[PDB]
Symmetry: D2
Subunit: 241 residues, 4 copies
Amino acid sequence: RILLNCDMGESFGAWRMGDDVHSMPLVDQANLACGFHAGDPLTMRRAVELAVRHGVSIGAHPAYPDLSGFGRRSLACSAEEVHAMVLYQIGALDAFCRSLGTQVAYVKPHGALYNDLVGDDELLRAVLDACAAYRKGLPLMVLALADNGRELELADEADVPLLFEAFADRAYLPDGRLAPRRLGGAVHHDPQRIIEQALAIARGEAFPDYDGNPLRLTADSLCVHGDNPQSLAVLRRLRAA
Amino acid sequence: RILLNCDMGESFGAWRMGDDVHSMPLVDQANLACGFHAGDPLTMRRAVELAVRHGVSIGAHPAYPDLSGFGRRSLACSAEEVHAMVLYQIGALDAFCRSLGTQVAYVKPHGALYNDLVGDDELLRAVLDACAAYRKGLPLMVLALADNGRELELADEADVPLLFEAFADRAYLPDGRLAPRRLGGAVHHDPQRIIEQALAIARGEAFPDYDGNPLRLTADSLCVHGDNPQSLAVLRRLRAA
Amino acid sequence: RILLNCDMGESFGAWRMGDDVHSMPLVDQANLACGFHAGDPLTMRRAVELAVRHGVSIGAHPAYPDLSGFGRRSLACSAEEVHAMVLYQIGALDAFCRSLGTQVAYVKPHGALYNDLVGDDELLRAVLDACAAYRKGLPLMVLALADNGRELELADEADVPLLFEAFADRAYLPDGRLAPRRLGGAVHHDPQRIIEQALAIARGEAFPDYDGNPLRLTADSLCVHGDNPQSLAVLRRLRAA
Amino acid sequence: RILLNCDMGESFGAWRMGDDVHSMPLVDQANLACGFHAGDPLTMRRAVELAVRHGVSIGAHPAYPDLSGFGRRSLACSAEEVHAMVLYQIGALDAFCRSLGTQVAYVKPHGALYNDLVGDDELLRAVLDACAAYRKGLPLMVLALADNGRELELADEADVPLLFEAFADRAYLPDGRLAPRRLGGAVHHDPQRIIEQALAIARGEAFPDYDGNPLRLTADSLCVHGDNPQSLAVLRRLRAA
């Protein structure tokens, strides 16, 4: 039923992020960095080889140009700037994919860019259009909400398929958005809390939001973070299914 | 007969380099930056649109990762690092090309990378292999010499076509290499000197090297720099032909 | 009476910004880049030598880390991140100042950072505290408004002197803020409009805002941009006085 | 007798390098990154607070501008470029030191820059002069050799004190240089080998070089790498003394 995704290839130079070798065999979808928040060219090659080696679907994980902030800070870019930096990043990653006989299978924006799309029509249009410009049929992954009507409508105008994503290890606000990271309790560090939220989403059942009040979602893809070490050491919830 | 090339799309953010709008209509080949020495994504889009608009053939102009040095400083990278950063840059530029119904037609390394290939077999192999990995038939542009036997042999092993390039506005050393920029007289600022060197190459006739001694070359492509303002204001030597 | 300021040392690597050699002798205050939006170390050395050579007061011109955006895009940083990046940049520039027998005489934030301080108490506190941490008495330059009561109060808490700045070549909104650059008419390109706005400020007289309605300011410092070529070719309004 | 040094504050954004919290209490000297190979401003603040908290002497650890290469790749910069980037980095770090009531106590170049000084008089002169320009008495740390006559002479011309450094966890070539990292066996991963080499240096006794042949050194400072996990888990050789 629901697919597991995970942000990977987020190492950079001599610095390691996550634990891609462990997480790759457990997920369906690898959202790989494209050098703007992480993932230098050699790291990118390695992330793709590792994904290819485990049969995992590769998404482009593009970000704002902000290495020191890990692409988790909103940067007030024009739609024109965003279109071009998405296109650039998709093509850079796809170069490695094709040398390894595969291709970029979807796009999942990283960090503040991903969250800025939830409230900004002009940025989502720009991102959708970059996807369509690159390849007919290339899906964009966006935040599942109770009502995804705005996203469905814009995706229709651009003729881009959408993948609706939910999160196992992030606290949700009442309004359907994710709790900002600049605030305690935004990431779940209780493994049992992560498992329960994940399975509530998998089943379309209510789960506790940030304030412990019930929130209901259904999603095509479920994100688990390799950054988060508890979400790592509990990742064998693939077996729960 | 001989094709004119020129390094373009080398602006970056708010900073302008060259004069692409003037130089583009006068050349056959536009070597476009890929974001490592110059050419942010929006600049890249613009350089491609401008090239497309004038019927000019687009080459990828990849460099070492060195913005503050404009990619003109040798960086001791591994062959593995170089392979990946070339592949990355070709794919980033090609994303813009295909959105505009064309494609990257060749590769010309920029700056120190280009010159480091003249003496380093392992780097040239890595660069040749990146070209082959990206697309069957994608040529690499290299420095024309009296004897290009080493390059022909490695290109044959990789099955990559070669384009032999000479320079109108750079002083040559007796040994066939270009005079390093960290030394006066390395760039011609006498327009008449530029025209004469260009036409000596176009005709396969001898021209004065760095020390005024005669050097003979024949080449498939002739580089003129838009950086260099005299080489710009003398660029209507296209008409000389 | 009123001092002229100008953003300078904003070249970066091989790229030139402004025309520092012309503008430096005409101004009282040189707001020098610190490597985050512009101004690599060698450019910084050169900007300081040029300022020293003309008797001009040197300010640190710190920005968000955003080279491709020229520091003109708001980046959602924490107060902690902003404090540290200001301190870093002041110390980097001051290293060159002291090697040349002078010192950083004030701080003027660049780009989106400068404008984000007008509405964000927590960022202004962080910036004020970086100034105080670096040196007792080091002034911060901020946007002159009709009422500067919020800034005076926070500056008092930090015990940092304030310099109130107005702009000759930027259109003002009715509310006292500058018109965002992502909107036509934000920069004056009519030289006569620039001269008139400058002298209205110099005299404390009303001038036309963005919508041509009158706005009154008095300021300790008047900014003229070397980016802006009309504001450059009209800069001999120093003589108007 | 001999002082222990260790490269620290080499984390960058969300990426962690080393284990500064463990290594700081065991060393005499903390060589802190300055943002060119590692160490963003907030990481720098943290490294300084941690050093201050444990009574450790703080050195500036400046590098070539090369984040993706961790400053371990030689970059052909001019002496002028190197002078300025050293000065810049010393001043950036010193800003944090002084806000915490201390100061930069010496300079140790990082990565390829450090090794390039061993063979390049013009770069060592430029680096020595940056030290002297910043502060009278600020020592430069350089590679201890059998004969340090070239370094002593240039340091004398610049009137900069020298600290002679040896390495516990790096293999030495017969000629006194360190084995390049682009070659197996360059870093010791045998803890006992590290302890023995360290104590041979501490005592001025011979130890096995890269080829197992004896090499004799005496040094003022002994480097142990927090990068290297075996050199970390054997760092309680401070107690050996």
